[PDB]
Design a protein around this nucleic acid. Structure first.
Ligand SMILES: [Mg+2]
Ligand SMILES: [Zn+2]
Lengths: 455, 1341, 49, 50, 51
DNA sequence: CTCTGAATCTCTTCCGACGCGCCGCGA
RNA sequence: UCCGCGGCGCG
DNA sequence: CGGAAGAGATTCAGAG
């Protein structure tokens, strides 16, 4: 039915009607002894009508309706991307699902996503009915419904009770590779944005400029056991495309670590000796030494011995205050040399990989979380920022460009004297411009990259 | 000098380049084309008159009677625009046409008339464009996008062998009419020439050539060049042009002047050609092999027998040569085949043709075009003739004629719209020349080749369709019956015309729904250009080459503004200065160069002419004499940039900004940032939402004034004067004495659109921005609109921004916001939603609106009146009833045992059920307006009668207040005329105003003026009473509504929405960001003076996106407010105004060689104080797009502001109280809210409705459906071993009509069992496959 | 049922065999005007045939 | 010749836009082909299980 | 309409255990045919099935 | 000089992500 | 409680 | 539209 009491007829009904009509006409022309050519015309029309019914548009001009569109025959209900096979048999719409705009949450552990309270209430409303009747607070489904729609805070207590171990699935369209769907143990936040852990967000190929994400809740207990054992993000550390880890930091985390490990030739408190990394942290936080200052520190490390024991060693090493601070979080078993250099993205990647090979899964997970926290905090304290004076323009550039244009004029006038073909003139001009551009780039990099300071 | 109004907030320009041409009226194309469509025209060139004359008159032969057209006129639109928008009726006016019917006598001459009848036909209703350039269709605003399509004419095109792939090149030339069949001509890998009609088939070209009245020998004589040979006994002569020798190899000795000389086996070169030319050779003697291998040009006859031995296109058979030579026909004619210059292609076509004669080709063409029917000579002839040469079935419009001739280099510019024989043969010759290589194919993507078709052309096309349908109806009426006893009023049916025009305006792909987020968005949508639509192009078939930029886009189409995604390239925006040539080609202004001095005259060019000349780059520096400083001035010409001397330059760009549209032009510092990010920012700027309170942007572009005034939202001073009165909603202005027309009241009034639903649910509000007694000037802005302040565009807001990573809350473009922003309602926005309630005559009695609702608490009903309508002003929340409506449920018979079961249960199982309208879930707000519309003959309820009473009272008070104001103006004019002389001011003062108007102070023209205004007063009171009577009948009259509805009720709900984490905000340079945290104001970083930062952005995005310009913007912001802060303090200390005056003069002088040059010495001190009051909040800075502020000027401005010269400052972290070691960039930035609020997207469904056929859950937020587990996600699950969750996803959660019930039961019971049945969609598939006639069934049950 | 059509022609009563129901239609010069009105759930609805 | 810090003239900017719209159209088209290819590969290899 | 594209006598009742003639209204006669018409006292699900 | 097979040419058919959101219209 | 078609819009 | 693949029809070369 339609508004105003009208009805939308499915095109199949119209095709059926037409075929019925033609059949009735042919039978009437037969039973009243029509002439030959008339019944031949009627039966040819009937055959054409059957062709339209099954596969309209398969031959000749397609049938069309008042909208001047071709009617969808039975065959069109199975062919094509709108067909029954692709649309419904695969790719079903599903109950117990929601969608929301995502958002960074840095305070989350690795395996827990921040889920808005309203969505949680809506999704788990059946479970809430169940537990509310089970605990005897509500007697009938009507009572449960009216209670939950009034949000009597006891419903909020029940809701906090239900989800405590109940993993949910997060999905980002398009699900390019299987990492696109992952399992998380929810945490309840007021607001309306789903909060992710940035590390896995890097794996999602997602960003935060307004990307939406969909959440599904498993129903059965076998299903949630599967979600926990297989899909939980604490398991998907290694990509399937290659052995290297997928959980790798980027942006502020890497910037913070890089700043934390970079040393300078002269800084506050250079050359002093620290009896332990804790004292390095103290001297930094008390403000008597800057992170970049180089210092000797007593440090203990461990190695997996031939038997499998973490045999200890302790020694004095030259390092930086920042490097000692970072080392303090490193779990037992990794060698100190891993830290004692300017840490880039690739260095952190290989550090995570070597952690995962040397030690088990869980120390690597804890190491990842600690890395994320410390990197963010020290990046914030760093206060790195970009200013217009930073993009220094190498003053050589004007000279180099004048040289290049002089050569361009020279080759152009050489062509003006007819000494060369135009194509080779073009080639020469292109070559000299490329050479000049490379020279300018080298000058810019040389001027920017290094600077002089007093010792 | 500045107008007095503009003295408020004189924005500081920085542009160095002067401006020689003001930006044109931005909407001009739409308004002027529609005017051209509707306005009267005696010449019948365009619009209604042209359309009518293109069909009329109409003549009947057996009827011996004629229908002919006198004139057309457009009636009055019965409803005003706001009434149309309120009541939902299309804004239209009646089309009236004067028509005459003629009958002649039944004797020669047929022209002897005997009777004439004339009357006016109401042949249709037509929409009118509103003053803002938008149409009003039903209840909606709609604006027609001007299309850009391939021009009619002829084009020449080649593919780089892609089709055949052997490496050759193939050519085709195509002719496109304005309407009618296409023709295209094509070569072949076998070098045959083929012709095709509407791309039907592929046929040799000779078919048409003989279909045209030409025989084979005529064809050869026309297309090819002929050579003559003579035979005498067995000696052979040929007649030669020496140049004809060029190209061949002299394998045999060749004779001239009686001497024979050839280097055998060698190619004839220019020395040989010159030798023969100086020899002046005419006829030479050649061997038999030379004439061998030559084609027979024509038939040859032997008179000794009356026999023919030579045919057309035949090779030279030596036997035939001997026979004809002995017969006596010693002369022979042959063609010439230069392997490069004179390809034998036509001859090969003549060989391969199946046809033999004109009628054979005609019937073959007919059977090609009309398969499945027996050919007939008349049928084929009629088909061909009417197809190409019936000026009504086919027509190259005049633009088609111009392009056709100009591509064929013919002198003529005009001609008949139908083709001809010479046209076809000429285009074929041109294609042959192209195949020879003495030419070049055409470039269709070139902008001198595509054409802009505006609304007028589409409107007249649809109206012509209506006219031809009506013409068929009229000729049918003429044929069917008598001619005397009827009037053409009945002969013409308006039905087809109205159907066609309404179908165009409602349905058509180019009649797209308008967007109204902000005035800029409305402007850019009106101006937008689309390549799609009727006769256009499809997103699937659009290759890269049409999308890509073409070098003649410069100055005509903005390259930046294109939308992103699959539509890219196919949608564009007019550049700011571009205007349409009468032929629809784009046109750009330029400045004439005259011997090194720019004349400053303006000339308009199209892509062809621009390509022909040399035009200088805009940024070229000049002296005051007009001579360029540099001799080697850089310029562009013929699609390439280079350097040229001062004298070679022909034209100069008008202004720097002429390459970009308005949308890009608004962005400051555009010259400093990448194109991708600039594009994204330009597009995003359209989506901005108007805030609760407008704010100026500090770093603007000057364009804001023009855009704000040109859009329709702001009320502009149409007549200068002094503002007499202002309130929240009305403006009354006294027109000055000189400006007012004689007999006018001298007072004008404006009424502001106080609150209404925008087309995207945003608010639309107009706020006055003047005060009593302030002078106002022609073109001043009296009332601001949405996102407008003092007549400047005010999309965004000014925020204090620090660039610094902060604890990951700004990770990956995330934005962190200080709570102070929320507390000040800086980004709070007002939204309006409209809800409709429809009452219908349901089964077992109507469904009625009422407050008598079953099974509901009375407290909710108390919010409603006794009629069942909420009182305006009541707050309402999700799930509550706004209006009560009730549906009968039919009989609902209960057996007596069920009757007693119901009785013990209660009042349940009622035959009457609630249907009342309910608040959408999660929405809450306040109820601002209620509307009712009801069918005639039904009683008006309490709510209906009360609102009708209030509305009629409103109309009465409005009309009476208009009367009072205008009569006060009239009597003020009485005073002004009477004081002029012969005064009796006190003697009149004792008398009441009626005496003043009645009495005569003199006997002269003054008394004539008094009598004139008294008659004016009588006329205005009579028109006022007539207007109020019409208004009252118009209010009291019922409405048509729709079928079956008794009455509709609409209620208006308004909601205030607030910035919240998950909301998306973005800055003009295109750096989107989701707000991810609000912060207690204490925690935000704060500078040395203790004022906190407001918004913290991640810096890491800047180098990788290359949005360097935005950083510069930030710096300028820190400078701008700097001055503001200082001047604010300088005001707060309440010092002498002269000191701040000199300071302001310094601040304006600060620029170097800036065009501004404003001086305060002419300003009186109260004006200076007003200026300071507006400048207290910062000094707005104007930076043109490509002549913007330089870094040196920025530094100087900062230095005058006492801020750090680098723009970086020290900063303290509030959360610990320590100091960041690095300096940080803190400044001011302009930010927008992007209308993607989180509460519009968050959605969740536990369970709900289910679809009918597939039994799957519904889709979409509105239906409260669930998300779609697409096939990619299914593959993702398959990649894991997670079988069980997949099975649960498919069977139980989605499609099992019983399994999900079992699951719901077990979950409620607390048992997480599962039972997978069968997906019902599988049974659906089985039934459809079986219905197809294919047996499919399960096995092993 | 509506006695006259929108053109002011006069109306006649006809049987729609395909839906077993009465309807009203108008004629001019004895030919059908191509206008019809039907009864659908206690209301009369009208339009082109 | 001018870098991003100094202003680009209108000519440099205009010629630069070519690459920008080329890249945007490039990615717009590439997405569809990539998705289609993935659908194919999945269909061919979906039977194989250890 | 009987013998039509939606003829209830063929495809079964539009409503659960409701005869087109109104002869029977409840499950007490579940699984019987009407005498005035060939519709069957059954569930609406049969409408989905029968061809 | 003719017949058959193979090769080439012509004509017809199939395919060119996934996901959400609003608006209009609808014999 | 609903089959869409067209259109913009964001991923 | 364009590109690629398949099927049918027509033409050329080799062998008899
Ligand atoms: Mg994204
Ligand atoms: Zn029955």
């Amino acid at each position: 039915p339609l508004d105003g009491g009208r009805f939308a007829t499915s095109d199949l009904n119209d095709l059926y009607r037409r075929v019925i009509n033609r059949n009735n006409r042919l039978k009437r022309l037969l039973d009243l002894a029509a002439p030959d050519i008339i019944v031949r015309n009627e039966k040819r029309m009937l055959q054409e009508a059957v062709d339209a019914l099954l596969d309209n548009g398969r031959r000749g001009r397609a049938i069309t309706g008042s909208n001047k569109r071709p009617l969808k025959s039975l065959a069109d209900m199975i062919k094509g991307k709108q067909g029954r096979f692709r649309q419904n048999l695969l790719g079903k719409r599903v109950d117990y699902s929601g969608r929301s705009v995502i958002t960074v949450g840095p305070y989350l552990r690795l395996h827990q996503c921040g889920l808005p309270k309203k969505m949680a209430l809506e999704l788990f409303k059946p479970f809430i009915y169940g537990k509310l009747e089970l605990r005897g607070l509500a007697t009938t489904i009507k009572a449960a419904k009216k209670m939950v729609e009034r949000e009597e805070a006891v419903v909020w207590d029940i809701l906090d009770e239900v989800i405590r171990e109940h993993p949910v699935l997060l999905n980002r369209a398009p699900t390019l590779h299987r990492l696109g769907i992952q399992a998380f143990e929810p945490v309840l936040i007021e607001g309306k944005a789903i909060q992710l852990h940035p590390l896995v967000c890097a794996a999602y190929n997602a960003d935060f400029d307004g990307d939406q994400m969909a959440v599904h809740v498993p129903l059965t207990l076998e299903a949630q056991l599967e979600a926990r054992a297989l899909m939980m993000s604490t398991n998907n550390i290694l990509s399937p495309a290659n052995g290297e880890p997928i959980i790798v930091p980027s942006q502020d985390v890497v910037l913070g670590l890089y700043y934390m490990t970079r040393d300078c030739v002269n800084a506050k408190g250079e050359g002093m000796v620290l009896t332990g990394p804790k004292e390095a942290e103290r001297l930094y936080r008390s403000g008597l030494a800057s992170l970049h200052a180089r210092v000797k520190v007593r440090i203990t490390e461990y190695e997996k011995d031939a038997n499998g024991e973490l045999v200890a060693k302790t020694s004095l090493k030259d390092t930086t205050v920042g490097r000692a601070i970072l080392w303090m979080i490193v779990p037992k078993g990794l060698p100190y040399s891993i830290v004692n250099q300017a840490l880039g993205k690739k260095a952190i990647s290989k550090m995570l990989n070597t952690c995962y090979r040397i030690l088990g899964l869980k120390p690597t997970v804890i190491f990842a979380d600690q890395i994320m926290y410390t990197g963010f905090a020290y990046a914030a304290r760093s206060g790195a920022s970009v200013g217009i004076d930073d993009m220094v323009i190498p003053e050589k550039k004007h000279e180099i460009i004048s040289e290049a244009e002089a050569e361009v004029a020279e080759i152009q006038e050489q062509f003006q004297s007819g000494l060369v073909t135009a194509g080779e003139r073009y080639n020469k001009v292109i070559d000299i411009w490329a050479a000049a551009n490379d020279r300018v780039s080298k000058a810019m990099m040389d001027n920017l990259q290094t600077e002089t300071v007093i010792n | 000098v500045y107008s007095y109004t503009e003295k408020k907030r004189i924005r500081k320009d920085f542009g160095k380049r002067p401006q020689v041409l003001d930006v044109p009226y931005l909407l001009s194309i739409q308004l002027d084309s529609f005017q051209k469509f509707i306005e009267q025209d005696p010449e019948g060139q365009y619009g209604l008159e042209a359309a009518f004359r293109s069909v009329f008159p109409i003549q009947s032969y057996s009827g011996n009677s004629e229908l002919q057209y006198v004139s057309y006129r457009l009636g009055e639109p019965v409803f005003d625009v706001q009434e149309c928008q309120i009541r939902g009726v299309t804004y239209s006016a009646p089309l009236r046409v004067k028509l005459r019917l003629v009958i002649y006598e039944r004797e020669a001459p047929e022209g002897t008339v005997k009777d004439i009848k004339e009357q006016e036909v109401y042949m249709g209703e037509i929409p009118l464009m509103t003053d803002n350039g938008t149409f009003v269709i039903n209840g909606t605003e709609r604006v027609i996008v001007s299309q850009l399509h391939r021009s009619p004419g002829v084009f020449f095109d080649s593919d780089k062998g892609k089709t055949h792939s052997s490496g050759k090149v193939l050519y085709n030339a195509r002719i496109i009419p304005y309407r009618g069949s296409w023709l295209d001509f094509e070569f072949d890998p076998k070098d045959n020439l083929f012709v095709r009609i509407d791309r039907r088939r592929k046929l040799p070209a000779t078919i048409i050539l003989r279909a045209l009245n030409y025989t084979t020998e005529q064809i050869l004589d026309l297309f090819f060049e002929k050579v003559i040979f003579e035979i005498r006994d067995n000696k052979l002569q040929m007649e030669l042009v020496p140049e004809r020798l060029r190209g061949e190899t002299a394998s045999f000795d060749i004779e001239a002047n009686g001497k024979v000389y050839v280097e055998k086996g060698r190619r004839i070169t220019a020395r040989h050609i010159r030798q023969l030319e100086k020899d002046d050779v005419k006829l030479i003697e050649v061997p038999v092999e030379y004439i061998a291998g030559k084609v027979v040009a024509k038939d040859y006859i032997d008179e000794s027998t009356g026999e023919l031995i030579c045919a057309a296109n035949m090779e030279l058979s030596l036997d035939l040569l001997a026979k004809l030579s002995q017969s006596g026909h010693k002369r022979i004619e042959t063609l010439f085949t230069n392997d490069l210059d004179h390809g034998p292609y036509i001859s090969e076509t003549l060989r391969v043709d199946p046809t033999n004669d004109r009628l054979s080709a005609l019937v073959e063409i007919y059977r090609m075009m009309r398969p499945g029917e027996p050919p007939t000579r008349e049928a084929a002839e009629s088909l061909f003739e009417n197809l190409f040469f019936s000026e009504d079935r086919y027509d190259l419009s005049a633009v088609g004629r111009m392009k056709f001739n100009r591509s064929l280099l013919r002198e003529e510019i005009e001609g008949s719209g139908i083709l001809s024989k010479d046209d076809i043969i000429d285009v074929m010759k041109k294609l042959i020349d192209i195949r020879n290589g003495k030419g070049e194919v055409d470039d269709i993507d070139h902008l001198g080749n595509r054409r802009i078709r505006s609304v007028g052309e589409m409107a007249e096309n649809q109206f012509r369709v209506g006219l031809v349908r009506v013409e068929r109806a009229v000729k049918e009426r003429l044929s069917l019956g008598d001619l005397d006893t009827l009037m053409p009023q009945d002969m013409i049916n308006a039905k087809p015309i109205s159907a066609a025009v309404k179908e165009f305006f409602g349905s058509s792909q180019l009649s797209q729904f308008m967007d109204q987020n902000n005035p800029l968005s409305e402007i850019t949508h009106k101006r937008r250009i689309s390549a799609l639509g009727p006769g256009g192009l499809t997103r699937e078939r659009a290759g890269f080459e049409v999308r890509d930029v073409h070098p003649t886009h410069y100055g005509r189409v903005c390259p930046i503004e294109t939308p992103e995604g699959p539509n890219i390239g196919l949608i564009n925006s007019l550049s700011v200065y571009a205007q349409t040539n009468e032929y629809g080609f784009l046109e750009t202004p330029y400045r004439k160069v005259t011997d090194g001095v720019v004349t400053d005259e303006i000339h308009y060019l199209s892509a062809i002419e621009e390509g022909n000349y040399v035009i200088a780059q805009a940024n070229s520096n000049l002296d005051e004499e007009g001579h360029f400083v540099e001799d080697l001035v850089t310029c562009r010409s013929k699609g390439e940039s280079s350097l040229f001397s001062r004298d070679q330059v022909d034209y100069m760009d008008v202004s720097t900004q002429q390459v970009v549209s308005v949308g890009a032009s608004l962005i400051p510092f555009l010259e400093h940032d990448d194109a991708n990010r600039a594009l994204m920012g330009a597009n995003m700027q359209r989506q901005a939402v108007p805030t609760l309170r407008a704010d100026k942007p500090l770093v603007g572009t000057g364009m804001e004034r023009a855009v704000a005034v040109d859009s329709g939202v702001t009320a502009v001073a149409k007549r200068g004067g002094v503002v007499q009165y202002v309130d929240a909603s009305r403006i009354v202005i006294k027109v000055n004495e000189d400006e007012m027309y004689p007999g006018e009241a001298g007072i004008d009034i404006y009424n502001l659109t106080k609150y209404t639903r925008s087309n995207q649910n945003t608010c639309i509000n107009q706020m006055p921005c003047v005060s009593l007694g302030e002078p106002v000037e022609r073109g001043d802005v009296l009332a601001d609109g949405p996102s407008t302040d003092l007549g400047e565009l005010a999309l965004g807001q000014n925020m204090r921004v620090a660039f610094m990573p902060w604890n990951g809350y700004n990770f990956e473009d995330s934005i962190l916001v200080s709570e102070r922003v929320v507390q000040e309602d800086r980004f709070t926005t007002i939204h309006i939603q409209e809800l409709a309630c429809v009452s219908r005559d349901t089964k077992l009695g109507p469904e009625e609106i009422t407050a008598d609702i079953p099974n509901v608490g009375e407290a909710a009903l108390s919010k409603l009146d006794e009629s069942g309508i909420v009182y305006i002003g009541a707050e309402v929340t999700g799930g509550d009833i706004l209006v009560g409506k009730v549906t009968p449920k039919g009989e609902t018979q209960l057996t007596p045992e069920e009757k007693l079961l119901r009785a013990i249960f209660g009042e349940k199982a009622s035959d009457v059920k609630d249907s009342s309208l309910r608040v959408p879930n999660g929405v809450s707000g306040t109820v601002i307006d209620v509307q009712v519309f009801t069918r005639d003959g039904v009683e008006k309820d309490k709510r209906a009668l009360e609102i009708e009473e209030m509305q009629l009272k409103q109309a009465k008070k409005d009309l009476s207040e208009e009367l009072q104001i205008l009569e006060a103006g009239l009597f003020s004019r009485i005073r002004a005329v009477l004081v002029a002389g012969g005064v009796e001011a006190e003697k009149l003062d004792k008398l009441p105003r009626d005496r003043w108007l009645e009495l005569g102070l003199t006997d002269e023209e003054k008394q004539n003026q008094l009598e004139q205004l008294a008659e004016q007063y009588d006329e205005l009171k009579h028109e006022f009473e007539k207007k109020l009577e019409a208004k009252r009948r118009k209010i009291t009259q019922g409405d048509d509504l729709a079928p079956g509805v008794l009455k509709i009720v609409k209620v208006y709900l308004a909601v205030k929405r607030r910035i919240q984490p998950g909301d998306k905000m973005a800055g003009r340079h295109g750096n989107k960001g989701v707000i991810s945290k609000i912060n207690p104001i204490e925690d935000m970083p704060y500078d040395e003076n203790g004022t906190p930062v407001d918004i913290v952005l991640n810096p890491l995005g800047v180098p990788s996106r290359m949005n360097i310009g935005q950083i510069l913007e930030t710096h300028l912001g820190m400078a701008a407010k700097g001055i503001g802060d200082k001047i604010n303090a300088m005001l707060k200390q309440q010092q002498e105004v002269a000191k701040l005056r000199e300071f302001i003069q310094r601040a304006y002088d600060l620029g170097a060689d800036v065009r501004q040059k404003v001086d305060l010495s002419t300003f009186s001190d109260e004006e200076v104080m007003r200026l300071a009051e507006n400048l207290r909040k910062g000094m707005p800075i104007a930076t043109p797009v490509f002549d913007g502020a330089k870094e040196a000027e920025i530094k100087e401005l900062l230095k005058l502001g006492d801020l750090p010269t680098s723009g970086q400052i020290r900063l303290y972290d509030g959360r610990t109280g320590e100091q960041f070691e690095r300096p940080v960039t803190v400044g001011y930035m302009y930010m927008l809210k992007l209308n993607h609020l989180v509460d519009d997207k968050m959605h969740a469904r536990s369970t709900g409705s289910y679809s009918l056929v597939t039994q799957q859950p519904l889709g979409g937020k509105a239906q409260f459906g669930g998300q779609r587990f697409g096939e990619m996600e299914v593959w993702a699950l398959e990649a894991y071993g997670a079988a069980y969750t997949l099975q649960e996803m498919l069977t139980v959660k989605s499609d099992d009509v019983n399994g999900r019930t079992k699951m719901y039961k077990n979950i409620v019971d607390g048992n997480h069992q599962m039972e997978p049945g069968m997906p019902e969609s599988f049974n659906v598939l089985l039934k459809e496959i079986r219905s197809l006639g294919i047996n499919i069934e399960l096995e092993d049950e | 049922a509506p006695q006259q059509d929108p053109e002011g022609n006069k109306t006649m009563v006809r049987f729609s065999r395909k839906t077993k129901q009465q309807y009203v239609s108008s004629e001019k010069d004895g030919k059908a005007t191509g206008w019809s009105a039907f009864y659908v759930d206690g209301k009369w609805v009208e339009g082109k045939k | 010749t001018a870098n991003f810090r100094e202003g680009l003239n209108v000519l440099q900017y205009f010629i630069s836009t070519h690459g920008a719209r080329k890249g945007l159209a490039d990615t717009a088209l590439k997405t569809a082909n990539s998705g289609y290819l993935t659908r194919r590969l999945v269909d061919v290899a979906q039977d194989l299980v250890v | 309409e009987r013998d039509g594209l939606f003829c209830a006598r063929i495809f079964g009742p539009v409503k659960d255990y409701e005869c087109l003639c109104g002869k029977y209204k409840r499950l007490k006669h579940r699984g019987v045919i009407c005498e005035k018409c060939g519709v069957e006292v059954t569930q609406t699900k049969v409408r989905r099935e029968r061809m």
